[PDB]
């Protein structure tokens, strides 16, 4: 009479890397690096402001595009590529600092 004791295995396993070897088959592995993107701003339950054609600095001065964003209140602020802060041409001294102030302004 014999009694023998062993471990399980599978036909097609997954190769992994270790301290000491490349491509060593194992029973199961799972991924550690996320690659699946969601092509949308997921904004469930977040007070969101989509500035659109309004530039984030245009909320301070109020050019015609930003007439609807003079006193907004948000948790998530979105700038779009078509946003222009100005109507009469000009630019803000220290623009980005003021933008960084406004993005976390609420």
């Amino acid at each position: 009479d014999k009694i023998c004791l062993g471990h399980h295995a599978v036909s097609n396993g997954t190769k992994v890397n270790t301290l000491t070897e490349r491509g060593v088959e194992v029973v199961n592995a799972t991924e550690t690096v996320e690659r699946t993107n969601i092509p949308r701003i997921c904004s469930k339950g977040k007070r969101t402001v989509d500035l659109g054609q309004c530039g984030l600095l245009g909320t301070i001065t109020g050019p015609p595009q930003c007439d609807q964003f003079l006193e907004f209140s948000a948790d998530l602020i979105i700038e779009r590529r078509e946003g222009s802060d100005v109507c009469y041409p000009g630019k803000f001294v220290n623009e980005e600092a003021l933008r960084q102030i406004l993005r976390e302004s609420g």
Binding site: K2, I3, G6, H7, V16, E96
Partner: protein, 172 residues
């Protein structure tokens, strides 16, 4: 492995055993039989779980924009930022690849230990009633029916009630 029983003297795994990770396969008068060992299999699964619960559902920190994709920031500061970010990416890329190798090396040896712990425990139950060939088997030297086999599994084997019989066949 590190304890040499996943590649050392257990030659291969048992693709049929889907009951668990580690288990018994006996042969006796009544015939063949295969069962898995819960107390061992769960000891390694509870351990991999610890690792996963440590790498997954981390609550990472909140970071803000310092760059601008639409209106590029000043050059000299844009380079200090591009430079700094590129450096941190080195660290994390290194930290990520090293951590997995550390963990994957550990898990692969960790499973060995559970095999050797099972093996070297069953052997002690059969104190002088059996001898180990060295393939992961135990040559039993007495009549071990399918109840005697299940006796071994749930650790009810009374080595004394077979000893005098076993010792006899051992020396002749």
């Amino acid at each position: 492995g590190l304890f040499g029983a996943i590649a050392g003297f257990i030659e291969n795994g048992w693709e049929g055993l889907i009951d668990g990770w580690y288990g018994f396969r006996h042969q006796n008068a009544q015939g063949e039989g295969t069962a898995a060992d819960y107390k061992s299999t769960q000891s390694a699964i509870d351990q991999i779980t610890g690792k996963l619960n440590r790498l997954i559902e981390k609550t990472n920190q909140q970071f803000e924009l310092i760059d601008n994709e639409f209106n590029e920031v000043e050059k000299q500061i844009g380079n200090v930022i591009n430079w700094t970010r590129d450096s941190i990416t080195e660290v994390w890329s290194y930290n990520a690849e090293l951590l997995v190798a550390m963990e994957n090396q550990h898990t692969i040896d960790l499973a060995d230990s559970e095999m050797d712990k099972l093996y070297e425990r069953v052997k002690r139950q059969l104190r002088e009633n059996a001898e180990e060939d060295g393939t992961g088997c135990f040559e039993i030297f007495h009549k071990c029916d399918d109840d005697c086999m299940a006796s071994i599994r749930n650790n009810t084997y009374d080595h004394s009630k077979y000893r005098e019989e076993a010792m006899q066949n051992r020396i002749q």
